[PDB]
Amino acid sequence: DGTGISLHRQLRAIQQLARNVQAVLGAFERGTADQMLHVLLEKAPPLAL
């Protein structure tokens, strides 16, 4: 509306977006660790055997 209130809205929106976009991108950085363990555990035979 070209007013102070209709901006701090936007500011609060821009700010949540950046907070989610950053959470999902760092999810793939942990998705590769969680992913790695499963392919290493898929082929590890017990030491006993």
Binding site: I5, H8, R9, R12
Partner: protein, 49 residues
Amino acid sequence: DVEFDALLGSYCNTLSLVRFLELGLSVACVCTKFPELAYMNEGRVQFEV
């Protein structure tokens, strides 16, 4: 969602202070201050015509 609640300009009237002698009726009585009136126990006014 930003929603405020506004106080839009409070108001006050003023007691008007009247003086009686400034009144049309400020006449009709001859008010005189009297301090020992607490003490006086019978004041009399006398007349002769």
